[PDB]
């Protein structure tokens, strides 16, 4: 890494000492350039994980996330640079500082070789995000939302810290390699039961799982757009990366204990998508949509079968690029109308023709048509879940049927209808918005040709 | 407001006749059954007791409601009709034209120049409409949904912009 | 009753305003002012060629548009597919497989050069 981490860190003094107005220019230049460099890690060898140093290593699961995060960094810059152009230079510089720092932690977290090093930076992502949602938020509930997001993540992470150091004292080193090659049978016992619960709850809260998820509708909606992406597009998957790594030692206790989590995710995903069927805030619509997709990842991890892990990463990457897109979409309207109510701005295809097209493919990707990467992920989990139990196809498909109704629902309510009479401030979409949307959907459809890169560490 | 009886019975006649259209189909059958429908309405026209009129209405509305055609004929350019809001998806509001690029603005100099005249005319007459409203507001707020006309000369009718400049029903 | 006298005047001024406003929605003969674009050489070659309009120009015009259509929509697409399906995929086994040519007793097989033994007599089951 050093070859990505150092350029990422070096963006921090660059943006601070950059020219007065060239901050957005230069930061966008090299963040795209750094993403190009991170494309180098998309290659993985036969079976051994790509190892660079003792503290840093990559595999066929971290690298597809690493490129996603570094590719995201330009996107938050352009999306947020609309409203941020109306404050002090230091304030705008402080934001770009914070996204650069937030991305820096994500790159170092995903390639962490020691589980303790993983946990330190995994929880360290809270500080850049927490200040983003609170300081630069555009509502009043953000103050309560930031507390909800911070406390939920921390309340689960702290048992992990106690559990993690326990492995250090008992088993020895916690390197992701030495853990794998020295896996021992975690026998069923009450102490092992809470050992299992502690090492799992921390990542479950950040998924989020059905019930430990009320921070998401508050955090995501109130957060600024530069944040509203990352809290949905990368760091939810950060909890995912934690699960797929920590479950190396939690066998065979996982199958005996997974039942409450499976039923909560498998049944709650129907309820969560049912919220999306009747919602009032467009941001909340996508937010609860993310919960349903992540809930499908939650069940996917726990069968611990080759197909499930592949469909886990496939949906995990695809949803992040998708859910990031919809937040850009809701941002554009929210700037023009200065409200988030769905029915307020009905009719956009009449006034904005291409915005409807971008909305069409955006709502289509969430609809997960074949061969879109969303479908290639959900379909894999359905087959893996069906092999686990034949009944689950009733629940698994029900969401697939239900997710069609709401995913096309904002398409009908916002785009396909009579334009609202009283609104008169809609402007022709800036070429920044359309260019940003292309930056989201073009890699997604391009990724369809070669799913092997994102298929996970079991291809 | 309060729909008086003579209006409501007329609504029954108009709607019931349109319903037997969906029933009678053939024109000669229509004209026969319409005349029986028409005269059977006129045979009871000397009811000095208004209560008896509603009592006559007490069976007519149920007579309509069970004799109504389950697939009544409605013209397409109307609610329920096949061509309801069919061409609405082209009704782009006229104020959107102010956002056109100058190259497209210069593409139609005559219409845009006249649009400026209308915009200038609307700007001048707006305040004229405004004081016209409070000059003749009913004591206690606007009583009726109706809208007073332009009383004096050189004054456009109050609240005229959206009605006059509404998009055509066939925009294409 | 009956248009009220105030509403009578109301609709009257609205009527003439609507007529005038829709009259303003008209289009003058000069409109739309369209700046030109660089013209491909084949177009100007056609215009001085179709000055008659007789079948002399009509048959060639229709067949040329059809001929170039066949080249750039039928010829060159099947050209690259043929290359794709003759050297690229064919170098990979079990990518293009067909049911064996259903042969019958009688006609010889082209490769073994042996007539397949025809069946024996059917019990004269004539109608």
């Amino acid at each position: 890494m050093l070859k990505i981490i150092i350029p990422t860190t070096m963006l921090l003094p660059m943006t601070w000492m950059s020219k007065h107005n060239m901050i957005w220019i230069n930061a966008t230049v090299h963040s795209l350039l750094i993403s190009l460099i991170s494309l180098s890690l998309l290659n993985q060898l036969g079976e051994n994980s790509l190892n660079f140093s003792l503290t840093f290593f990559s595999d066929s699961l971290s690298a597809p996330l690493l490129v996603l995060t570094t590719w995201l960094l330009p996107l938050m810059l352009m999306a947020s640079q609309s409203h941020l152009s109306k404050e002090t230079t230091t304030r705008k510089k402080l934001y770009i500082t914070m996204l650069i720092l937030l991305q820096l932690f994500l790159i170092m977290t995903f390639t962490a070789t020691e589980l303790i090093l993983f946990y330190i930076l995994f929880e360290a992502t809270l500080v850049p995000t927490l200040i983003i949602i609170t300081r630069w938020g555009n509502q009043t509930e953000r103050l309560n939302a930031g507390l909800y997001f911070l406390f939920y993540t921390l309340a689960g992470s702290l048992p992990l810290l106690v559990a993690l150091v326990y492995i250090q004292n008992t088993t020895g080193s916690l390197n992701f390699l030495i853990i794998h090659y020295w896996s021992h049978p975690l026998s069923n016992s009450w102490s092992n039961i809470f050992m299992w619960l502690a090492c799992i709850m921390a990542f479950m809260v950040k998924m989020p799982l059905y019930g430990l998820h009320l921070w998401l509708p508050k955090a995501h909606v109130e957060a600024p757009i530069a944040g509203s992406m990352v809290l949905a597009a990368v760091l939810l998957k950060l909890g995912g990366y934690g699960m797929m790594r920590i479950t190396t030692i939690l066998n065979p206790l996982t199958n005996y204990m997974a039942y409450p989590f499976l039923m909560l995710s498998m049944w709650g995903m129907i309820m969560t998508s049912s919220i999306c069927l009747r919602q009032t805030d467009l941001k909340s619509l996508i937010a609860y949509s993310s919960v349903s997709h992540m809930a499908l990842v939650i069940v996917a991890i726990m069968i611990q079968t080759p197909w499930s892990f592949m469909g886990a990463t496939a949906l995990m990457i695809a949803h992040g690029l998708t859910s990031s897109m919809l937040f850009c979409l809701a941002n554009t309207n929210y700037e023009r109308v200065h409200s988030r109510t769905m029915i307020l701005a009905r009719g956009l295809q009449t006034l904005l023709p291409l915005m409807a097209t971008w909305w069409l493919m955006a709502s289509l990707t969430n609809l997960a048509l074949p061969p879109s990467i969303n479908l290639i992920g959900e379909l894999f989990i359905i087959t893996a879940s069906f092999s686990w139990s034949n009944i689950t196809i009733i629940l698994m498909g029900m969401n697939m049927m239900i997710t069609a109704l709401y995913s096309l629902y904002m398409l009908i309510t916002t785009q396909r209808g009579k334009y609202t009479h009283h609104i008169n401030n809609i402007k022709a979409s800036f070429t920044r918005e359309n260019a940003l949307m292309a930056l989201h959907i073009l890699p997604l459809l391009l990724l369809t040709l070669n799913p092997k890169m994102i298929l996970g560490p079991l291809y | 407001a309060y729909l008086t009886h003579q209006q409501k019975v007329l609504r029954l006649y108009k709607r019931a006749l349109r319903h037997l259209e969906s029933w009678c189909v053939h024109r000669d059958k229509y004209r026969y059954f319409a005349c029986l429908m028409r005269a059977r309405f006129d045979e009871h026209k000397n009811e000095k007791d208004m209560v008896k009129a509603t009592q006559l209405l007490r069976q007519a509305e149920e007579e309509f409601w069970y004799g109504q055609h389950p697939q009544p004929y409605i013209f397409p350019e109307s609610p329920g009709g096949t061509s309801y809001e069919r061409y609405e998806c082209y009704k782009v509001p006229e104020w959107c034209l102010d956002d056109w690029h100058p190259s497209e603005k210069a593409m139609y100099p005559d219409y845009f120049a006249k649009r400026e005249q209308w915009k200038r005319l609307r700007r001048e007459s707006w305040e004229r409409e405004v004081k016209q409203l409070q000059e003749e507001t009913p004591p206690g707020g606007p009583r009726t949904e109706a809208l007073p006309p332009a009383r004096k000369e050189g004054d456009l009718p109050p609240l005229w912009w959206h009605i006059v400049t509404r998009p055509r029903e066939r925009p294409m | 009753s009956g248009y009220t006298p105030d509403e009578k005047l109301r609709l009257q001024q609205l009527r003439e305003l609507r007529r005038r406003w829709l009259k303003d929605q008209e289009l003058s003969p000069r409109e739309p002012v369209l700046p030109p674009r660089r013209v491909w050489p084949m177009e100007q070659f056609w215009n001085k060629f179709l000055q008659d309009g007789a079948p002399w120009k009509n048959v060639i015009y229709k067949t040329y548009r059809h001929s170039i259509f066949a080249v750039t929509h039928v010829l060159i697409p099947v050209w690259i597919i043929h290359y794709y399906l003759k050297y690229h995929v064919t170098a990979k086994p079990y990518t293009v497989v067909e049911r064996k040519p259903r042969i019958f007793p009688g006609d010889t097989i082209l490769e073994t050069g042996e007539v397949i033994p025809l069946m024996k007599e059917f019990p004269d089951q004539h109608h």
Binding site: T350, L351, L352, P353, A428, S429, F430, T431 | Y90, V92, P93, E94, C96, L97, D99, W100, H101, S103, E104, Y108, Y111, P167, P171, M172 | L22, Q25, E26, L27
Partner: peptide
Amino acid sequence: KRLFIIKPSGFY
């Protein structure tokens, strides 16, 4: 009798 076609600006 051809007339104007009020449509959104698609130049951008």
